[PDB]
Amino acid sequence: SGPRTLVLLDNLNVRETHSLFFRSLKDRGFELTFKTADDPSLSLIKYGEFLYDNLIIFSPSVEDFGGNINVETISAFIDGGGSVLVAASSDIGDPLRELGSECGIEFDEEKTAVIDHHNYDISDLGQHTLIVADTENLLKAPTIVGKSSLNPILFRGVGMVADPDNPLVLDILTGSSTSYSFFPDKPITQYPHAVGKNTLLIAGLQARNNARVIFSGSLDFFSDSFFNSAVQKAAPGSQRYSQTGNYELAVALSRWVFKEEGVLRVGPVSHHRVGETAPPNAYTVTDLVEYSIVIQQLSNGKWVPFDGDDIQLEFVRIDPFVRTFLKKKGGKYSVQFKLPDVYGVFQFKVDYNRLGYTHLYSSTQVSVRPLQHTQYERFIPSAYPYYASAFSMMLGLFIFSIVFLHMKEK
């Protein structure tokens, strides 16, 4: 994705109090433009162009975006290939909830907070609204949340939940074991939304077009006060930490969403018979076939060859006939095998799907035709009698002729 980014601010002074995040983001090499969520000159597409390649929403408490930024427009932007980041404090506003419902993640009510009574930091308003999330309940995928070890993080936001049997959604950071999300003023009457360890704090989506979306559910998670604070749970005996470990997590999240950390690409594929160099038309049945693919990973700013322990090749007709592990040689994953007895149209599906990496999918169609009438085995030993028999009688016939026409009666 291109380096141009749009930031939707809330009061235009937020940039000052979020300076650290934006200075880091610019230092990586992005072009940041700051606008106010209600701005008449605001638009994403102009004659079908997508003039902004990345989108950042740091404006909770919005009801209508300025200009033609609908929720269907942002949905078409995510369907086009863009990557959004949205952060929402305890004043949600309707279109952020609706964008979440479009992606598949359901925010909580507009006045709710992730209330936790065992893990609140000392720097609280007496409501226990500030929640100290440990580094244990994280996603545990080094492509997203970085390689290093992190100190307990700080959070002040609205708790969302995601479908358990949802294939696309991710959960970067769940709540604690006792945290519940409900109105801090009103007593609990209904069943509270996302009451346990299914309270989500940071939740991401990796769409079918490989569009990275992160719902953060708390603006202050990215703030300047929480990058430079000091964290300690108010439960007695708990240790005090010098740095909140929020900065490294925020940087790793930002790198993942904007297509910098985990990216995979499929180069040229090539299949041919063992011993030749050009792909034939219509392989025959039970013929040695060699498949070679090249996969590249975006490391820093350049494409390097990929490590790839477990990568599988499927040879499918309607359902897979042969599945094998590709093996690395040179710079390509290549495997040689035999074609099954069934004739038809078979295709190779190489689908690499991992937690954090992009979705790789390359399928090439090939037709496996049965044997020609000349390629059948001939002169088999087991049938030396029959051959003999036939020729014998031919000889017999000839002899008979010479004795039937020139026979001398007696």
Partner 1 sequence: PGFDRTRNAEIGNKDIKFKHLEEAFTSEHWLVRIYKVKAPDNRETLDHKPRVTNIFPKQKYLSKKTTKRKRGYIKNKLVF
- Name the residues that contact ligand KZB, by CB under 6 A: 379, 384, 387-388, 391-392
Shortest separation between residue 139's beta carbon and partner 1, angstroms = 19
Shortest separation between residue 383's beta carbon and ligand KZB, angstroms = 10
391 vs 400, which CB is nearer to ligand KZB?
391
Instruction: Return the residue of 19, 68, 228, 401 that touches partner 1, per CB under 8 A.
Output: 68
318 vs 380, which CB is nearer to ligand KZB?
380
Residue 234 CB coordination number (10 Å): 16
* Unique residue bearing structure tokens 């893990």: 119
Shortest separation between residue 110's beta carbon and partner 1, angstroms = 8
Exposure string over 186-197, b if 16+ CB within 10 A, otherwise e: eeeeeebbbbee
Cβ-contact 181, 158 below 8 angstroms: yes
Cβ-contact 174, 137 below 8 angstroms: yes
Give the Cα separation of 278 and 173 in Å (integer): 50
47 vs 379, which CB is nearer to ligand KZB?
379
Rule CB under 8 A: say whether 63 interacts with partner 1.
yes
Which of these ranges, 101-109, 323-331, 346-354, 401-409, lies near partner 1 under the rule CB under 8 A? 101-109
Which of these ranges, 31-39, 223-231, 344-352, 359-367, lies near partner 1 under the rule CB under 8 A? 31-39
Tell me whether strands 173-174 and 200-206 are parallel, antiparallel or unpaired: antiparallel
208 binds, among ligand KZB, partner 1, none (CB under 5 to 8 A by kind): partner 1
* Unique residue bearing structure tokens 């601010």: 9
Cβ-contact 196, 177 below 8 angstroms: yes
19 vs 392, which CB is nearer to ligand KZB?
392
Which residues, 6+ apart, have CB-to-CB distance to 92 below 8 Å? Answer: 60, 61, 107, 108, 109, 110, 158
379 binds, among ligand KZB, partner 1, none (CB under 5 to 8 A by kind): ligand KZB
394 vs 407, which CB is nearer to ligand KZB?
394
Rule CB under 8 A: say whether 110 interacts with partner 1.
yes
E strand or H helix at 15, and its extent?
A: helix 14-17
Instruction: Return the residue of 30, 82, 97, 350 that touches partner 1, per CB under 8 A.
Output: 97
Rule CB under 8 A: say whether 207 interacts with partner 1.
yes
Phi and psi at 143, nearest 5°, equal -70, -35
β-pair partners for 290: 272, 336
Exposure string over 9-42, b if 16+ CB within 10 A, otherwise e: bbeeebeeebebbbeebeeeebebeebebbeeeb
Q: Please give the structure tokens belonging to residue 202.
A: 């940071």
69 vs 253, which CB is nearer to partner 1?
69
Cβ-contact 156, 71 below 8 angstroms: no
Interface characters, 172-201, with partner 1 (x: CB under 8 A): -----------x--x--xx--x--------
103 vs 326, which CB is nearer to partner 1?
103
Instruction: Return the residue of 57, 74, 85, 103 that touches partner 1, per CB under 8 A.
Output: 103
Shortest separation between residue 140's beta carbon and partner 1, angstroms = 23
Give the Cα separation of 77 and 8 in Å (integer): 15
3-state secondary structure of 183: coil
Rule CB under 8 A: say whether 113 interacts with partner 1.
no
Cβ-contact 291, 334 below 8 angstroms: yes
9 vs 201, which CB is nearer to partner 1?
9
The residue number whose beta carbon is nearest to ligand KZB equals 388
Residue ranges that bind partner 1, judged by CB under 8 A: 10-11, 36-40, 59-69, 78-79, 91, 93-94, 97-98, 100-104, 106-111, 163, 166-169, 183, 186, 189-190, 193, 205, 207-209
